[PDB]
Amino acid sequence: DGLFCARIFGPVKDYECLCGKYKRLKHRGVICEKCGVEVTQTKVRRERM
Amino acid sequence: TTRVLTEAAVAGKRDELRGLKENVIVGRLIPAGTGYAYHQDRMRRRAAG
Amino acid sequence: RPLVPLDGGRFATSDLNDLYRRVINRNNRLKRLLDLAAPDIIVRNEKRMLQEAVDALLDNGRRGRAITGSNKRPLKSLADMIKGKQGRFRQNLLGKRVDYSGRSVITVGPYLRLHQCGLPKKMALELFKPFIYGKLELRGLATTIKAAKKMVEREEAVVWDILDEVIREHPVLLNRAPTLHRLGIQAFEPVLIEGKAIQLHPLVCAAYNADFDGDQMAVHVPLTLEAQLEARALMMSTNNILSPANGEPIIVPSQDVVLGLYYMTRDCVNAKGEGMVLTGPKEAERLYRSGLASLHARVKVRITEYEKDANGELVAKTSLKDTTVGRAILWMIVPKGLPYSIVNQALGKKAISKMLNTCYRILGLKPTVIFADQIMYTGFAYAARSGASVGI
Amino acid sequence: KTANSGYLTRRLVDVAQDLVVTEDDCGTHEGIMMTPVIEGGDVKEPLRDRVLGRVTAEDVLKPGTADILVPRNTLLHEQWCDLLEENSVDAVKVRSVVSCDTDFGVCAHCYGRDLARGHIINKGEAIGVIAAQSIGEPGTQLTM
Amino acid sequence: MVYSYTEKKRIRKDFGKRPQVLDVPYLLSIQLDSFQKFIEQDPEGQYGLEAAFRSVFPIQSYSGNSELQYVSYRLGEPVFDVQECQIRGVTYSAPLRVKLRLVIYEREAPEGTVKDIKEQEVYMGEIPLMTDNGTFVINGTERVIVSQLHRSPGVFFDSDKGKTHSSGKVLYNARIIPYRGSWLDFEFDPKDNLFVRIDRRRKLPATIILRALNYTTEQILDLFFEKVIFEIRDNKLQMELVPERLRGETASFDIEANGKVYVEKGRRITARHIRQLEKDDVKLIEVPVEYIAGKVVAKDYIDESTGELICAANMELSLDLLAKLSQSGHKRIETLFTNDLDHGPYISETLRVDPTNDRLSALVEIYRMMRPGEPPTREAAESLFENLFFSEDRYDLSAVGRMKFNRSLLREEIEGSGILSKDDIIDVMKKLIDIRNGKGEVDDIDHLGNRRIRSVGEMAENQFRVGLVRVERAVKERLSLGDLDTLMPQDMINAKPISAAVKEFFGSSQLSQFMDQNNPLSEITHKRRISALGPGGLTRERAGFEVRDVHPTHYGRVCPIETPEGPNIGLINSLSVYAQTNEYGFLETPYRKVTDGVVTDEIHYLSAIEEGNYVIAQANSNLDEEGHFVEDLVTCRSKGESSLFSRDQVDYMDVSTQQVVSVGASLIPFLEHDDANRALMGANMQRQAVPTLRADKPLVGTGMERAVAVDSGVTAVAKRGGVVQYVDASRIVIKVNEDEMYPGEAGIDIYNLTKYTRSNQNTCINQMPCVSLGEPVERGDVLADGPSTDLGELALGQNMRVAFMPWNGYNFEDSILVSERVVQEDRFTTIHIQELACVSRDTKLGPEEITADIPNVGEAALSKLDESGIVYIGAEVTGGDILVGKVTPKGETQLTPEEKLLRAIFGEKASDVKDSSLRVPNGVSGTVIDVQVFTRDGVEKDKRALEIEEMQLKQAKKDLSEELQILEAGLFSRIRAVLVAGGVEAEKLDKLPRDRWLELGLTDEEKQNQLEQLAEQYDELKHEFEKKLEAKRRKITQGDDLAPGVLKIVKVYLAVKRRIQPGDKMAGRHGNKGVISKINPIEDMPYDENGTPVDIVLNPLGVPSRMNIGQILETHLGMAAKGIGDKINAMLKQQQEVAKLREFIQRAYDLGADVRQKVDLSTFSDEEVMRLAENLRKGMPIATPVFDGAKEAEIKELLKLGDLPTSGQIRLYDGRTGEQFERPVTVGYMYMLKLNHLVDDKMHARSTGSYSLVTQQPLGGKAQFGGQRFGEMEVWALEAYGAAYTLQEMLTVKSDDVNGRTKMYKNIVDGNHQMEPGMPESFNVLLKEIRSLGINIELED
DNA sequence: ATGAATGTGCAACAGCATGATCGCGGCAACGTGCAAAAGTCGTGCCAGC
RNA sequence: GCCGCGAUC
Ligand SMILES: [Mg+2]
Ligand SMILES: [Zn+2]
Ligand SMILES: [Zn+2]
């Protein structure tokens, strides 16, 4: 829950979510149970406020 | 810019992108020269609905 | 607002991040001090501190002193970084750095036409790399893009030939650093040279306000069909001859050209050839190049003029006039339709400008461009032949 | 002084950027008296330089009364100016952009022929930026 | 005797015409002298570290009976020499050791001590040293420090130009600028009110501080005004008579003197009436009552009847008040002057403005005004006032500040306390009142007597003082809780703050920059640089037109020519040739004393202030044989202006014509014929020429080349050399002549020349010897000439046969047309050494070993690597070839079966390790030179490391063996003489070694004394050789203590030869520059009758408009010199007799017009005449001094001596058509320099490189594959053209369209040329930024 | 003759002062103890050679 | 992501 986090602002490294639970393109717009990071194209770090 | 924004913020005004400076900032065709004809066609479509 | 990286995995907190983190640091402690039933003075002070921190984050340098970071410099807030100079100067509003652009020192090329600039073959093959990829793939020399990349780096001879094929009629526009007026960025037709500096036509130096003592110019490539037409029909050097400020021709010969024209059109009291009568301007060149006559001698030459009183028609009149050998030689480059009283002078940097202005007004644009090129060629040649030198 | 001239050019360009020739002729009868500029006893600007490349708002009358010389709303050029200078004309009333009378732009006639090309100015040219650049191009050489 | 050996090699034909009195000083004296006075021990505390130690130490606790007593200090020996320190990459410094002891005082017995621990030295801090050239080698760099020219502390009066309120009221203000502490100002209102701006707070009355100095209302009025007494006895009301007071006034009533009318009512006011009244001795007389109404009472009379009194000072009087004072018995009433003719009403008005009349009230007022926080409690305000001013430590006027304070106030004493007293504020207030009244004048702010100069020593002293204050504050806490067992190092000696501050100053400061290394001239002119910027200086934007102007006192102290051009003009200066600094820090200039009409040779040094009183003559004024001036009227400079004065009124004489100019402008021949701005440009351009392959002397110079080259430290000067013994391409050894030796151990002087070595500007530094073998060498002789130096002569260019003529437009504007023989003869070819570095450092997963074996790299790239993994020395490299083979370990602990089979089929690592191998950057070619592997201690040394150490040992032993050879030779000679003295065996003794067993014993005395002493000397000399050989073997080969993260480092140098080419910039030394335009073949250059084609063709059109007459005169003079050289060369071609050659050289040396050149070949032997003639066969290198040199007549005579056209122009034939050019063309030899602006470093071209995360725009600048920035003006021009599609494609698809870039790249590769534009990322970033504020911006549909 | 409203003048605070290139260095802000879970290590297991 | 310093037009 810092200034640069993963639950909001989108992911950090490509289509890979935190903890490696869901890191693929088979999953789109899913929320991992352990971590709230959503899968996206990591270009959404420029839009989420 | 601090003065202009607030006097524009409280009034809730619009830009409408009529001059050349506004269109250069956005990156569209300026209403002059070769780009003037393109802005003439667009005006009729907006007025006609 | 990414962190600034440094040696090792340590990531330094930037200016913007510090301003935020102070705000949350105050906010957590305040929202805690609310529920502890703290005395009014302490929560009052914390509220003032949080309010000041928020104000400093939103605009540093207002309502008191300016907070500072590691160095004794203000920490720029959201206000100071809107885009560049608190406005939109650097990163927006005509401040975009563009690719497909080069930069090198400029020298003089007198063999060039009015619409040509010498472009090094090393800047080309880099500005026109995607065009080269397209032409390589079109002709089947490289089936895959990777092969085209590898062979462009290896710079085989066929790559040079394909670059010459691509360049043929793709206008490129050069500009100087302080673009004062609209003539400070003009589009030329590149000619590849085995060299390392841009060769600029001497006539356009007055428009560019550029002199060859270390001056550099940028080379921007218009890479679209609309852009190429705009750079050909609106920005070509042969297109804008009259300056858009007073109507006088900005592209006018100066320096060595003017000196050569002045030396050619002068009269000496006594020289090789006095009172000679010769058939026309053709004989004036033969007599001078043979050494039998001097450029400043006074003779009588039978010369033909062309006149435009008739509606769209040229009438030819022939008469015997008293002039010099140099003026007779110079007359051979002027186009049809100009009276002879326009070269029977000294041509001192003003009569030549009026010569070009009258040629433009009466004849048009193509004749005046050809006339300007011929004038500069002959002025350079005869200034060099004169051997004018400054001594003590 | 180059900085103080560049700032002036910046301000002029910002003010004049929104100016494009969007009309052909507003039809207004307004004009501006253009007499040769004189200072004391020396001729310092002839009428030919001031009125060249402009449109006549009203017909110029020769000293002989009831004698028309040029039609109203016509462009003056080398032939017209040479004919006009042969006579003894002193004042010519010509239309200018201050009285274009059009909205959001300037009529192609009220603004005279462009100085870059011989013909009259075509629609769409950004005359404001050209004017600002022309005014601010000198200034780096003005003696202050 | 008249000429030295190196001068005998080539004598410059000086044109002189004016004898020199004082020779040029060391020319680098400011830096070396400042650092010497910063480091050298001083018995007193004048300056240096000792002064700072006395200022801070001793220290003691707060009544803790413990004090810190110190004695002396010492600086240790540096652990690396300059060369090794430069190569390794660390700061050249020395340890700092200080002697100080601990004393413990008795608590029970006052003023008694119980313990005294005299501890030894404690190490504290690193102080970098200055190299003998004047550079501070820090972090493996040069880092010269420029002196600062800042405002001198003192008292400065100003008038503010008289235009603040636009009312025409000139406002006088005073400032008290200290060396350290708070400021203090006095300011005059439009309403004539005294305002004091303390530390630049709000304007405050001066009366508050005046009362805070314990001054009462009556006392301040008495001190600041002249009071008068009005006596009213028996209703007469008499008035005192002071004739000098009343000058302009109106007689409101008849004035009678002793009952006789003297001045009538409204009578004459002329000085005659005043003189008549003064002549008559008249006592007090009565005056009208209404006259006293306007007067103001100063004192406060007390009524004797009751305690009530009229104590209202600075107030008028009432009619009823007269009755009250008469009843009280006030016979005499004291009132101030109240006169306004020259004086005015002040002070009293300010006392009426503010009512605080108490010291405590004033203190609390000023404390509240300066500090708006907590109010004081009778202690805070007093402490704040004590700390602000009249404090020993917090505020401190410098000694020079005190001197200027006393001089500005005209005080006899020049010394005093460095603190301001109560009388001082009164004095400055009085002087401000006087300057307002009319007396006195305002001083100029740009006066060089008011602008102090400070050097590296003073700045380093200030930084050390700050560090000392910090460590003292840290130490003071120890003694409070310190026990007797606490030793000095255990008492937080705390060297860290001092070292941190010193290194911060030396490494990162406004006035410690990278030194320029192109030519010795750039180094010389950078070391003696005057900078007005810096910490205590002024901002570039802050400087007005007045500062950037040439004040008339910049005559002999600051150069008026040499200065940067665009931004920094007038803010960066250069010291003149003869200028130095005062004992306080003011610039002086030499002058010659003139007594009666004859100028003596005695030299007096005058500061800026002193020279404004005398009358100073001109250097270019004629003299007589005895010394009198040749005219009765002589031009002079009296006080800033110049006029003509009588021969008997002359007081001082200029030493030489070079006095005004600096070093950089002194090397321009015919400087007086050049325009001032063009001379500025030429002087600035000289400091940029790159040293070429071969040094080439200037055919025409100013004789100052030798002084520039010798004192720059670039050359190798024989310190005490005699006759050279062995000359090598890298070493020179000289056997010193016997007349001067150091007794004991004998010895020879050995020089280790520095071969090809990278400079700061990537240029190469080379040293080539001059002497051949057995050549005698005197003191100060130059043996090895560095870059751009020929026989000790600064030579930073090459002479070129320049012809001034336009050549088919190829020399248009400022373009230069160059022949191809220039390229073929390898002129202007320069060496550029570039540094590429690689460091092997450990990481998380293991060590980063370096080896040749690099996975996934073919055998093609391994061709040029050794068994260690770095390229062979001498391998020619280009493109992107691998240089060092370095591997970075990767993390993997899960051996999956795929990885198992990978390790089974491939090597054990299976290419797990990465390859972080340094590659040659793009555009860099050239053969490698050196590799500089260094190893951390403990780790196994590299295979090639042993060869480096073995080479070092080889050179070490070879260098030490020569002195040992000489010493044992002397011992053998002594033993041979002893054995010849008795029992000589002739050659038999010499045949047997060890002196044939020491010749047995022979006589008893010889065996006991001679042979025994010889054996003892041999034994101890052998042992002394062995011990130092062992120590120097040990210290050279040691494990370096690298950085803790760094394990092992490797550095690779490249060497690239840059041949001259069209784009490269070339310039002369007269302000003419240009870029080449074409390398024409030899057969196209114009040729004279004999067929010699010119080398450079210039444009005549550049002379008449730039007023570079130095070009034409230099070309004519060089043509004459080359004609003389050609005559001598042809004469040597026919090998004629020595007598004829000597006669010709003699007749060509004494030519001129009363030149001060008395060289003669009669005292020259045969062999040196031939050597001289073979040395000047290329051309007679003449020298014309700066402002008094060769005239046109002398140049014409020199040309006529060589059988050349007098007018200086020859008939030039065209190279192509062979047709004679109609006019003659001026052909001459001009000295052309090749500047450091090469196109090879100035071309860029980008199509798609690397963008930035924010704004997604391409990067900027070369070495980053950036793109040229499309500025605002360019877009304005695009709009003016009407070109809109170009604007759109240059605004979106080239810069900020993330998808647009890729789409349009694909379209071009396909061949579509379709726009398909979009929305720039920059505007989205701006929208997000604005939305991050409280303002909402959205895009409507 | 005096009070109040108004207009004028003066002082403090805010924004702003050319464009494009090239080359070198130096460079910031914890703790706490237990549940609760999770990971880990010493140990015993069957399956392949 | 700059800050100083120097340089070119
Ligand atoms: Mg230039
Ligand atoms: Zn996850
Ligand atoms: Zn109109």
Author numbering:
A (entry chain D): 54 to 102
B (entry chain D): 1328 to 1376
C (entry chain D): 250 to 641
D (entry chain D): 789 to 932
E (entry chain C): 1 to 1341
Please share text taken word for word from the publication where this structure appeared.
Transcription initiation in bacteria involves the recruitment of RNAP by sigma factors (σ) to promoter regions located upstream from the transcription start site (TSS, position +1). In approximately 60% of bacteria, a major variant σ factor, σ54, forms a class of its own, lacking structural and sequence similarity to σ70. In σ54-mediated transcription initiation, σ54 recruits RNAP to genes responsible for regulating a variety of stress responses, including nutrient depletion, membrane stress, antibiotic exposure, and biofilm formation. In this study, we used single-particle cryo-electron microscopy (cryoEM) to determine the structures of initial transcribing complexes of increasing RNA lengths from 5 nt to 9 nt, which allow us to propose a mechanism of RNAP promoter escape in the σ54 system.
